[PDB]
Design a binder for these strands. Structure first.
Ligand SMILES: [Zn+2]
Lengths: 139, 98, 24, 149, 129
RNA sequence: AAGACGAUCGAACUCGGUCGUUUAGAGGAAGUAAAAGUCGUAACAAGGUUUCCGUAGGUGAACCUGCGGAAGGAUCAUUA
RNA sequence: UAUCAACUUUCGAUGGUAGGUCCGUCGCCUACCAUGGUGACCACGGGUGACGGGGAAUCAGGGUUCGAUUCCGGAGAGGGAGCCUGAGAAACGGCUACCACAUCCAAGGAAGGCAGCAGGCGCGCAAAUUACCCAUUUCCGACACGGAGAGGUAGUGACGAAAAAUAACAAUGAAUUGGAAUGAGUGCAUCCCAAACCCAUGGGCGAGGACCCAUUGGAGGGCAAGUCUGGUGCCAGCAGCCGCGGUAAUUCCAGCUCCAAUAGCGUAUGCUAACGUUGCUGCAGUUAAAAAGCUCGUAGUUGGAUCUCUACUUUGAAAAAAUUAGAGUGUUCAAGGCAGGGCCCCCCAUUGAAUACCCCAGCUAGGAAUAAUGGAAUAGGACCCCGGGGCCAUGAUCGAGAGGGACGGCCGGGGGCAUUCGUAUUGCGCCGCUAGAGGUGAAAUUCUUGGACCGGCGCAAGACGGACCGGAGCGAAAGCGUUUGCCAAGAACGUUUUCAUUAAUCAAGAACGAAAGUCGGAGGUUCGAAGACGAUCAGAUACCGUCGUAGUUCCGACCGUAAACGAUGCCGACCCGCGAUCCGGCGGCGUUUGACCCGCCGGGCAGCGUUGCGGGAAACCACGAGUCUCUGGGCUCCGGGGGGAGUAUGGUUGCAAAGCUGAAACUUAAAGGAAUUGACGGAAGGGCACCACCAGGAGUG
């Protein structure tokens, strides 16, 4: 059990500090890993250049083709697979364009039936993808 | 889930017992966990005691008995219908069947 | 079975040391 | 329970409430001290002296007939041994076990008991050094202990 | 071994109370226990008790009135100031209307209300309600 | 005033050592995902050889076998 | 942060002495000596997307996180180093060098430092005018006068915070009607302000779809809000999660409608509460992730009762403001400000511009409970007398249903050594008879007229210790069963014996530790990994059978692993009942030559009734898994969704096999615990029909 001694503040402080590393949520934010492997490097959004136009298939029991894009970031040159959210917005995307990608819902976790996509496109050609979908800023 | 309070054997305050071997399969089973069955039967079955009595050279000769100590493992004791499964509450009865 | 998965890992990391000790 | 073994047995003495000598005990304080001195000279530990006085002389408690305990009576006169009786018997046992352990080499039970006894020797001697009963340089050596018993 | 004999005293009382007993025997006697049982008795939680005095630690036999819900100790025995006393009342006492926290101050072993009137703090022994 | 023997502070360069962090690699060997493929049926009903555990060997594969142990067994019980 | 356990000390590390040097103290430095100094209470080394603090965010209480940022202190002006002047600098809007970078050039040379205010480039998800004035705030100077990108005022600005329009009021059954009401805006005066700008005060324009139009996300559930309509048809797409789309979609694409907040709102990533899923308050470890195999052992933590009935606690002193809390006060209210109120050239309201908090440590004055600690024991100990005397009640708390030790009679498959015996098993010898014998579901391999199997006689070898043998004993566990002897040890009980707290649990350490395995010898009966062969099968390197190597046994030395299990750490307290059992002790009435019978006490292995006074998700638990929201006896180890994975790497140990220590990228929405119902079983028991069978009749194919 616990040591309730009046001079056990050192034993309690050392035990609690060590057991916090067995927490998955704590060891992820207080280590070099999970941040060096993070392509964004701890940022909210990121800009990149579109390399290809790949379509990943949704996992079971779903059946569809997710319109994704192979993007290479600028600040570190890493290759990520963003997601073009809305309907037909992949046509607004052209290869070798400047797109502002961001996270996808869950932090560093694949959202929905998409196999390994954990990012999504926010802007393209320095204009927002949402305005292109609503008939504004025709680009 | 724990099926038996005695863990299917009779060992209280010990760490290891001498393992004995079964009779019809020769499997190493602990001495306390084995299902023992002391069968005491005459050498001559009831179908031939009369024929031996007529062929006996004595006047009053009691036929001997055959003392056989049988040790059955749990697998063979159930297969040979020596023991059977019982209800969850009927398992606690330790009195042998009359 | 779980005891054979442990037996494979023992035989897997045993040959890993062979191909690692031979390169030194 | 015990210190180096399991068991919660309570087998000890139960001293009475009356801290007074009975009326049928005519031995005065001087007579009891003379009996202790005669028994202490012939090599009887304070534990053994109190047993004889209790079972043959009716002295239920030497602490009641006199004003001091048996060891303090010997310490005042100067008949107390160099090392205490309890520490002497622990070393006596360790030498007997070690002498048995050097002949019988593969008795892991005796080797296990030798660690238990030597652990009690070091903690009992540590208490005596704090009470200044033993010199600070005192140390139990497994080789030179046989000459102390 | 037997440490904090006050805990073994209040645990024996709390158990014997829930069993419906009328008298409980406490094996080790102490002045800290008597000062604790006196505060519980002055507020009408326990009756009279005879301090059985043998030539040893001594035993106590306490009468029970059926009015006690639970009596316990605070094992680390923290140092309670006059400002932090309000925090201990909310956590330990089941209501602001009854229940007491027996403290140990320089003026003697007493409850928390008397420590407020005498304007003094100290260490905390336990509670009863 | 230039200039110069010398002692101290000491930048900097070069070549070693050490520490920390990115990265290429024939070939080798795993994990995971997609598993809508092939072979067998190891496990779950005594899963058709009860399951398992430690150790060791063997075998296309799951696995098989020897030794001791466990019931989380398929027996809380078998009669002088 | 231990995957950093020893570090410092030739070449100053710790100290001593003499001196040098400095404004002055000092290994600050030099010279001679000393061998020290720090560390498990974490030194040293490494990491920091570390300037410290006043503070900030969020909070029921505790806490968690943040603090480059206007206040204080420190540090640096591209990187280091050196110096000049001066009261003050190791200054860079001073200087001299080298390094990097860079400017002009008649190619000889010269010159440079925006982490100052604007501005440019680069970098990025990410951050404003190459503006005005020294009028306010203050500073500097020979000075009332000069200067100040310090500062102030505008510009940019949805970082945010406060106030607050987008209508109000009446008849008639609505882009119907009707007159009223001030703003937005727009100019013109005044005010404002160094000039301007903004606000405010007026008057002139200024609303009827008061066209002077409110967006941003949703409408299956969580979660307030459509069985609407059209389109698409597992496509396109939606969806944080569960899911939706498979031609009649409340979830997609749109129309209409509705809901929520509102000049805002959605999203992404951090952070806090949610989270009692890091649990000091306040979590768990039988079966869901979990107590080391076991014991010993120092640091550490925690320690019985007992005497007048320096930690703690209280007070005071001291403390930068701002911030926070908070008193007063109608900036039109408010965020805020520290000002301003009342009377006919003043006066009154001492006009106000409070007060609280400021951990810990240090300082001060009280209290004396609780927790440590010291005092007289080989006394010259305290007081006197005045080296000898006098004197004190002359000075030792209790022995714990704490512990150690002793002693007494016992008890036990406890351990070591030696000895004895027992039948079996295999082999061998002789004799008898005889042709099969072995084995299997059935057979075969194998062994057989050179005599197998079977009977009798007795010889050798190595294992093993059946039955008795038990929900019995002992041991710290692993483990332990023939007789007898020897050696040492142990629990319990008994005691009016002794010591007098010596204790409990315990990091890094240490002993022991089944089976298998490794090394060197001895041995090798049975069994038997591997292997060979004979079956079985679609195949069968398996299950079955016949032979059989390493092993299995002993000695010495390693490995330190198990479903090492009660899947339940150790010590202590309280807490139900009953009948047995083993050991010691006590008492009682007989029977039998100690045995047996009936109770009591202590300890131990367990059981039943508890329908458990209680606990828990059940199952189940009185060797507690009870006395935890009415949450606190002490302590150690240890768990944090499932996989990757006990894997990679590093350290360490080992002859090796491997042990201990031990991640991450990535992947996943479940995995799992207990119980219920049903289905199923080459599981058991009990029953029923020719759409089943036995015995048969007709056939059919
Ligand atoms: Zn069997």
């Amino acid at each position: 059990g616990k040591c309730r001694g009046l001079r056990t503040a050192r034993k309690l402080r050392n035990h609690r500090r060590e057991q916090k590393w067995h927490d998955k949520q704590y060891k992820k934010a207080h280590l070099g890993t999970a941040l060096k492997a993070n392509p964004f490097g701890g940022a909210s959004h990121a800009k990149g250049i579109v390399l290809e136009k790949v379509g990943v298939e949704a996992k079971q029991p779903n059946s569809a083709i997710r319109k994704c894009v192979r993007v290479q970031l600028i600040k570190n040159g890493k290759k990520i697979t963003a997601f073009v959210p809305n309907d037909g917005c992949l046509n607004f995307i052209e290869e070798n364009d400047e797109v502002l990608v961001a996270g996808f819902g869950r932090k560093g976790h694949a959202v929905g039936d998409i196999p390994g996509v954990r990012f999504k496109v926010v802007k393209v050609a320095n204009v927002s993808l949402l305005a292109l979908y609503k008939g504004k800023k025709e680009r | 889930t724990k099926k038996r309070r005695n863990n299917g054997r009779a060992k209280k305050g010990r760490g290891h017992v001498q393992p004995i071997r079964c009779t019809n399969c020769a499997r190493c089973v602990p001495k306390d966990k084995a299902i023992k069955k002391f069968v005491i039967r005459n050498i001559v079955e009831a179908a031939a005691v009369r024929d031996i009595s007529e062929a006996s050279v004595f006047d009053s000769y009691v036929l001997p008995k055959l003392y056989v100590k049988l040790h059955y493992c749990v697998s063979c004791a159930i297969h040979s219908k020596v023991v059977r499964n019982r209800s969850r509450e009927a398992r606690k009865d330790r009195t042998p069947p009359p | 079975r779980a005891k054979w998965r442990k037996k494979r890992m023992r035989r897997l990391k045993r040959k890993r040391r062979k191909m690692r000790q031979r390169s030194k | 329970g015990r210190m180096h073994a399991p068991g919660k047995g309570l087998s000890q003495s139960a001293l009475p409430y009356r801290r007074s000598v009975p009326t049928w005990l005519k031995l005065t304080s001087d007579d009891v001290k003379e009996q202790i001195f005669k028994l202490a000279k012939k090599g009887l530990t304070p534990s053994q002296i109190g047993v004889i006085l209790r079972d043959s002389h009716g002295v239920a408690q030497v602490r009641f007939v006199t004003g001091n305990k048996i060891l303090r009576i010997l310490k005042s006169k100067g008949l107390a041994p160099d090392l205490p009786e309890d520490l002497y018997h622990l070393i006596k046992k360790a030498v007997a076990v070690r002498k048995h352990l050097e002949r019988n080499r593969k008795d892991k039970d005796a080797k296990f008991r030798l660690i238990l006894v030597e652990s009690r020797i070091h903690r009992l001697a540590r208490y005596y050094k704090t009470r200044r009963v033993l010199a600070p340089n005192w140390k139990y050596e497994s080789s030179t202990a046989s000459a102390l018993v | 071994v037997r440490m904090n004999v006050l805990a073994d005293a209040l645990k024996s009382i709390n158990n014997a109370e829930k069993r419906g007993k009328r008298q409980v025997l406490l094996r080790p006697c102490s002045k800290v226990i008597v000062r604790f049982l006196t505060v519980m008795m002055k507020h009408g939680y326990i009756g009279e008790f005879e301090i059985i005095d043998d030539h040893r630690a001594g035993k106590i036999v306490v009468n029970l009135t059926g009015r006690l819900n639970k009596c316990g100790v605070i094992s680390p025995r923290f140092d309670v100031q006059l400002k932090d006393l309000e925090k201990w009342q909310n956590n330990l006492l089941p209501s602001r209307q009854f229940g007491f926290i027996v403290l140990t101050t320089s003026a003697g072993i007493m409850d928390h209300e008397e420590a407020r009137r005498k304007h003094t703090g100290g260490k905390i022994l336990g509670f009863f309600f």
